[PDB]
Amino acid sequence: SDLKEVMVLNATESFVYEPKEQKKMFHATVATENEVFRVKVFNIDLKEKFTPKKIIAIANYVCRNGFLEVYPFTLVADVNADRNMEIPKGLIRSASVTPKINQLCSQTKGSFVNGVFEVHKKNVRGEFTYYEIQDNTGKMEVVVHGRLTTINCEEGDKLKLTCFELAPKSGNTGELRSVIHSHIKVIKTRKNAAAS
């Protein structure tokens, strides 16, 4: 949990993760030359620091659930042009690799998951919406509740998921569940998309 100098890879928009108090955050992915870190940023004013390709020094963050959490008390500082980090392309690509469904749904232990998944079917059941996602290894379900039930995602669209919890279930029945920090970007097929 020491000071880290990292290159910013990507960041989401800021969004409200807790509607009643309108608490906001954004997710970011950053890298040293050896490792990629998933970052939850709870001070939205840091959006500018979190520009991709910028190098920043972060310290006094909190490590929780495999994420670095950045709060107002966290140090985030611009690092100069002197540094000039080379982040191996393979490492950067490792940031974007989507886990395989057959491995996910067979997990015996929970974890938090990011990835892009194609939606096969959608079943809205009350306050929960179930998406059956599929890849070449099989199919499983993504379950969302709360604010994420309003997203517009239809068969053939992809869910780009950030911070979903894998909840193990016996029989390779494990499922991805939205949690307080979950974020979805829907990638719509040309067929389903708005057009002009």
How many other C-beta atoms are found inside a 10 Å radius of the C-beta of residue 195? Answer: 6
Helix (H, G, I), strand (E, B) or coil at 167: strand
- Which of 49, 65, 97 is the C-terminal boundary of a domain? 97
CA distance 191 to 141: 23
> 120 is in which domain, residue-wise?
98-196
Query: How many folded domains does the chain comprise?
Result: 2
Query: Which stretches within 7-137 are classed as H helix?
Result: 89-96, 101-105
CA distance 8 to 163: 18
Closest CA to 143 of 161, 170, 116: 161
- Which of 50, 75, 97 is the C-terminal boundary of a domain? 97
Pairing of strands 55-59, 36-41: unpaired
Indicate which technique resolved this structure: X-ray
Closest CA to 177 of 118, 133, 135, 138: 133
Residue 147 contacts residue 159 (beta carbons within 8 Å): no
Q: Which two tokens stand for residue 70?
A: 């950045």
CA distance 117 to 23: 27
| Residues 62 and 119 reside in one and the same domain | no
Residue 58 contacts residue 65 (beta carbons within 8 Å): no
Resolution (A): 1.8
